[PDB]
Design a protein around this nucleic acid. Structure first.
Lengths: 83, 189, 150, 208, 129, 83
RNA sequence: CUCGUAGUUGGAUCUUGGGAGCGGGCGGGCGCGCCCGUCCCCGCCCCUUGCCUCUCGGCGCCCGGGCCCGAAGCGUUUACUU
C-alpha cells in the first residue's frame, strides 16, 4: 500500500485469489472473478447481492475449479446441503 | 489417626486423616477387608473441580498405583458416597526428579531412569486421572501462537463411568501439569 | 539404507499405539516369568521365546506384562547365551553356504554370498565388540567357522 | 444451493429423475468426480449423487442469473445430441446459441466475422467442445459444463454432475434447468408445474 | 539411513504447496521443527496445526497458506559470528521487508532480527520467505 | 484443491490403507479365543500362530499357519476387539 | 559389476516443560498496573532442574554458630554463541 511516510509497497492491490489462498500476477487469463446472484429466500428469487469467486488462473487446467468453488459456496452459506 | 489408615510420609496431616477414618469404616465389609487396610493414602490437598465446586486430591506415597486401582474402584464407588459433592481419584506423587544434565551435587543419584522425567510422569498423570477408561488417542493442537491444547480420545464402551465427571480430569490436570486437555470419544473400527 | 539386500520391503510390525496391557487372557506376570525362564532354560533363543509366548499364552510385548524383558531378566538371572542372535543365525547359515560352495566349487556366484557372510558377521562382530557381549578381540577368519560346530 | 426445501430436494424432481435414468453415469471414473457419488453397484457403473447434482445445478442457475443483462452469454455445443436442447434453451432464455458448427476465432480472433462477445460460456460437454473450451480458457470468461464419471473435467468452473451421453437424461437436465434458473430469477413463484414435458428435449430425427 | 527430518519437512511442504493442498501431513517430526513451526507462526506464515501422536515418528499436520514462498535447510550446520549475520541476510533471503534467517543458539530459537536484538548468534538452519 | 481433512479424514481409507502408513499405525492382527472343539475347556492362541497349538478335542490340529495368517481347521469361537 | 578399511557423515526422545509470579524494559485495549503475548525480556521469583558442607564476618536475621555470600563458585566433560 501507500504508508504514511511513503513505505510504498503497493502501486495498487492486485485481485487476490481466495479459492486457494494464493496471489496471482498482473498478466493472467484464467483468474476469473465471476459473480453469483443472491437469493431472497422468500421464494428463492434473485436479489441484488453478490457472491463472488476469483480463483488463481492455473488451477483450471488441473480442473479443480469446480471443487474449489464447491468449497467456497458451502463456506459462503448460499449452499448449505451436505450429505 | 493414621495407623495403617494413613501411612506417614510428609508434613501435614489434616484432611487425609478424616478420609482415612472413612476408609476404616469402609474396610469392615466383605469387599475391602485387608484390601483397604494397606494401600491407604498419605497426603491430601484441596483443589477445585470445575466451576462452582471444589474437591480433594489424594497423594498415595505411590509405589502402589499398579495394584492401587484394584481397590480404588471400590474406593470411588464407596467413598464418593461419604464425601459426595466433591471428587476423589488416585494420583502419582512426584516432587520431581530434577534434570540430570544439570548437576554439581552428590546426594542426587547419578543416573536418571526415564520414569522420573517430566514427560513420563506426565503420561502417568493422564493415566492417574483416567484409569478405568483407556486412552485411544492424542492429537495435540496449538493455541494462538504456541500455547498448548491436547485432545485425548478414550474407549467408547468405558463412558459408563466418568461422564458426570467429564470436566473433573482437565480441572485437575491444569494444576498438576499446567495446560489444557480435552477428552473425546472417537469412532471404533 | 539397505545395502546387503536389494529389496526395500518392510513388514515387521507396528505394535498397538495403546501401550495398555493386552487383556484378552491376562495371564499375569507369574506364569509369564515361569514360561520365560522355562523357554530360556531348555535352550531357546529370545526371538522364538517371544513367538511361543505370543502363541500359547499370547503377548504383544513382554515389557507390557513386566518391566524387565527377556534379555534383561536372563541377564539378571545368569543365563546369558553363547553368542547373540545376529552373529549366531548368520554363522549357522554360513556353515550351510560354505558346505554348499566347497561341495560344488564351480558356483562362482555363491562365493559372492559367502563374502557378504564374512562381511555381515564382521560388521556385527565389531559391533558386539563394543557391545561387550564378546571379548575385546573376537576372531573370525573362517577359523572360528566350526569351533562351536561338532 | 439455497435453504428453501422447495427449491431443494422434492419429489417433483425425483418422479422424473428416476424416470430418465439420472442415477447412473458410466463404467469408469476420472480422479475429479468423487465429490458427487454415494453408492456403487455390483454391475460396473457408478450411480451419481442427484442431490449434489441439484446443488451444483442451482449454483449453475445462480451463475446464469448473475448475468445482469441477458444479451451477452453463449450456450454452445457442436453435437446434435444437445444441439436441439441448446437451441430451445437459448430461444426461450435470450442469451445467444451456437451449435452444430463452430468457428475458432469468433470470440478469440481480434478481427473476425461473427466476432461475438460472450460473457459466460455454457458447453454441453468438454469432450464435445474441444476448441471452444480452450478459447474460454484463453479469454477471461467462466465455463459451465456437464460432468460424467468418465469425462475429462479440465477448466470446468461450474460442474453439473450427470451422465451427458443420453438424450433422455440431458433433456431432463435442460428442461429442469430452465425452470430452476427462471425460478431463482423469480418469474416462477411456485405457481405452476411447467407444462413442457421432457419428451421435448429428447433429441429427434424430425419427421413431425 | 533416513536423515534430517528438518530438511524433509522443508521439502515436503514445498512439494505439496505448489500443488495447493490446504493442509499437509508429514510422517516424521521433531521438537525443533515444531519450534520452526512456532517461529513461522509468530510471523503468521502458517496457521495453527496439529501434532498427531505416534511414538514411532510423530506426524505433523500443518496448514499451508498464501503467506509463504519457501524456507531452506542448510546441512552443513554453520555458525553466525554476528559479523556475518548481515552478509547472510543480504545473500540468502529475498527480502528485508519479510523473511528473516533462522538461528539455533544459546538464547533460544530465533530469527535473525530477534537474534541481533539479543546480541547472540549461532548456527544457521533456516531462512524463509 | 482436493485437500482432504488432514486432522481427521474419512475412516474407511485408513483401514483400506496399509497398516504401516496409518494416521496412527496399528496392527491388522486380532486375537483368537477359540474352543479347540471336542473338550469342555476353552483356550486361546495367537491369531496368526506360526507355531501350532494342538487341538486335542476333536483329535486333530487347530492352527495351520498359512502365509501371513493362521487358518483353523476346526475351531469355534472367533473373538473380535478386546483392548 | 559386487565387497570392504580408513572416508566424510547421520532416526525419535532423555525440560523449548506450569504460575496472575514480582520490580524493571515492551508490542497492545486501557490509564509500565488488569492483563492477550508457552515464565512477552532480565535482577527477585514459584513447580526443579548444582553447590557454604569449611574459617572470620557484610545490611541482614536468630541465638561463637546458621538461610546467601566472600578469598571463590572445588562433585564429570568437551563443540559452539555474548
Amino acid at each position: 500500500m501507500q504508508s504514511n511516510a511513503g513505505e510504498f509497497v503497493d502501486l495498487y492491490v492486485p485481485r487476490k485469489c481466495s479459492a486457494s489462498n494464493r496471489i496471482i500476477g498482473a498478466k493472467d487469463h484464467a483468474s476469473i472473478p465471476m459473480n453469483v446472484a443472491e437469493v431472497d429466500k422468500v421464494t428463492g428469487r434473485f436479489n441484488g447481492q453478490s457472491k463472488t469467486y476469483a480463483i488463481c488462473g492455473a488451477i483450471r487446467r488441473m480442473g479443480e475449479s469446480d471443487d474449489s468453488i464447491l468449497r467456497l459456496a458451502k463456506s459462503h452459506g448460499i449452499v448449505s446441503q451436505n450429505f | 489417626s493414621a495407623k495403617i489408615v494413613k501411612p506417614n510420609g510428609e508434613k501435614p496431616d489434616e484432611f487425609e486423616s478424616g478420609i482415612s477414618q472413612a476408609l476404616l469404616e469402609l474396610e469392615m465389609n466383605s469387599d475391602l477387608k485387608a484390601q483397604l487396610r494397606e494401600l491407604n493414602i498419605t497426603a491430601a490437598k484441596e483443589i477445585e473441580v470445575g466451576g462452582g465446586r471444589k474437591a480433594i486430591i489424594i497423594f498415595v506415597p505411590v509405589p502402589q498405583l499398579k495394584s492401587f486401582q484394584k481397590i480404588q474402584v471400590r474406593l470411588v464407588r464407596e467413598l464418593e458416597k461419604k464425601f459426595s459433592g466433591k471428587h476423589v481419584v488416585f494420583i502419582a506423587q512426584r516432587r520431581i526428579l530434577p534434570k540430570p544434565t544439570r548437576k554439581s551435587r552428590t546426594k542426587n543419584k547419578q543416573k536418571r531412569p526415564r520414569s522420573r522425567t517430566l514427560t513420563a510422569v506426565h503420561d502417568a498423570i493422564l493415566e492417574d486421572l483416567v484409569f478405568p477408561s483407556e486412552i485411544v488417542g492424542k492429537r495435540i493442537r496449538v493455541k494462538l501462537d504456541g500455547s498448548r491444547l491436547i485432545k485425548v480420545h478414550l474407549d467408547k464402551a468405558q463412558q459408563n463411568n466418568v461422564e458426570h465427571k467429564v470436566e473433573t480430569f482437565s480441572g485437575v490436570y491444569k494444576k498438576l501439569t499446567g495446560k489444557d486437555v480435552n477428552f473425546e470419544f472417537p469412532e471404533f473400527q | 539404507g539397505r545395502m546387503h539386500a536389494p529389496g526395500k520391503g518392510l513388514s515387521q510390525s507396528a505394535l498397538p499405539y495403546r501401550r495398555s496391557v493386552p487383556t484378552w487372557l491376562k495371564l499375569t506376570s507369574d506364569d509369564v516369568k515361569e514360561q520365560i525362564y522355562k523357554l530360556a532354560k531348555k535352550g531357546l533363543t529370545p526371538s522364538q521365546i517371544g513367538v511361543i509366548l505370543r502363541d500359547s499364552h499370547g503377548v504383544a510385548q513382554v515389557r507390557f506384562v513386566t518391566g524387565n524383558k527377556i534379555l534383561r531378566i536372563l541377564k539378571s538371572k545368569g543365563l546369558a547365551p553363547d553368542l547373540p542372535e545376529d552373529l549366531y543365525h548368520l554363522i549357522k547359515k554360513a556353515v550351510a553356504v560354505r558346505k554348499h560352495l566347497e561341495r560344488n566349487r564351480k558356483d562362482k556366484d555363491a562365493k559372492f554370498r559367502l563374502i557378504l557372510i564374512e562381511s555381515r558377521i564382521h560388521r556385527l562382530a565389531r559391533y558386539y565388540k563394543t557391545k561387550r557381549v564378546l571379548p575385546p578381540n573376537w576372531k573370525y577368519e573362517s577359523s572360528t567357522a566350526s569351533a562351536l560346530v561338532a | 444451493s439455497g435453504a428453501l426445501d422447495v427449491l431443494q430436494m422434492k419429489e417433483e424432481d425425483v418422479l422424473k429423475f428416476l424416470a430418465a435414468g439420472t442415477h447412473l453415469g458410466g463404467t469408469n471414473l476420472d480422479f475429479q468426480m468423487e465429490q458427487y457419488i454415494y453408492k456403487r453397484k455390483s454391475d460396473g457403473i457408478y450411480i451419481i449423487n442427484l442431490k449434489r447434482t441439484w446443488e451444483k445445478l442451482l449454483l449453475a442457475a445462480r451463475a446464469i442469473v448473475a448475468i445482469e443483462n441477458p444479451a451477452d452469454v453463449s450456450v454452445i455445443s457442436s453435437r446434435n445430441t444437445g444441439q436441439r436442447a441448446v437451441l430451445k434453451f437459448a430461444a426461450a432464455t435470450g442469451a445467444t446459441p451456437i451449435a452444430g458448427r463452430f468457428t475458432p476465432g469468433t470470440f478469440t480472433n481480434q478481427i473476425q466475422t461473427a466476432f461475438r462477445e460472450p460473457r459466460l460460456l455454457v458447453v454441453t460437454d468438454p469432450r464435445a467442445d474441444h476448441q471452444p473450451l480452450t478459447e474460454a480458457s484463453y479469454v477471461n470468461l467462466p465455463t459451465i459444463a456437464l460432468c460424467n464419471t468418465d469425462s475429462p473435467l479440465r477448466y470446468v468452473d461450474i460442474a453439473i454432475p450427470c451422465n451427458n451421453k443420453g438424450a433422455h437424461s440431458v433433456g431432463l437436465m435442460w428442461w429442469m434447468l430452465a425452470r430452476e434458473v427462471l425460478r431463482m430469477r423469480g418469474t416462477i413463484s411456485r405457481e405452476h408445474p411447467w407444462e413442457v414435458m421432457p419428451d421435448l428435449y429428447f433429441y429427434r430425427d424430425p419427421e413431425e | 539411513v533416513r536423515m534430517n527430518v528438518l530438511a524433509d519437512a522443508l521439502k515436503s511442504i514445498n512439494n505439496a504447496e505448489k500443488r495447493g493442498k490446504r493442509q499437509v501431513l508429514i510422517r516424521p517430526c521433531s521438537k525443533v521443527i515444531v519450534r520452526f513451526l512456532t517461529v513461522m507462526m509468530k510471523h503468521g506464515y502458517i496457521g495453527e496445526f496439529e501434532i498427531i501422536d505416534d511414538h514411532r515418528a510423530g506426524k505433523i499436520v500443518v496448514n499451508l497458506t498464501g503467506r509463504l514462498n519457501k524456507c531452506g535447510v542448510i546441512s552443513p550446520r554453520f555458525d553466525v559470528q554476528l559479523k556475518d549475520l548481515e552478509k547472510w541476510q543480504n545473500n540468502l533471503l529475498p527480502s528485508r521487508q519479510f523473511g528473516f534467517i533462522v538461528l539455533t543458539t544459546s538464547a533460544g530459537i530465533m530469527d535473525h532480527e530477534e537474534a541481533r536484538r539479543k546480541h547472540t548468534g549461532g548456527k544457521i538452519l533456516g531462512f524463509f520467505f | 484443491p482436493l485437500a482432504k481433512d488432514l486432522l481427521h479424514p474419512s475412516p474407511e481409507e485408513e483401514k483400506r490403507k496399509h497398516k504401516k502408513k496409518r494416521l496412527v499405525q496399528s496392527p491388522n492382527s486380532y486375537f483368537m479365543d477359540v474352543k479347540c472343539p471336542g473338550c469342555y475347556k476353552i483356550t486361546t492362541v495367537f491369531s496368526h500362530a506360526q507355531t501350532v497349538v494342538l487341538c486335542v478335542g476333536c483329535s486333530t490340529v487347530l492352527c495351520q499357519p498359512t502365509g501371513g495368517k493362521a487358518r483353523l481347521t476346526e475351531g469355534c469361537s472367533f473373538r473380535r476387539k478386546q483392548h
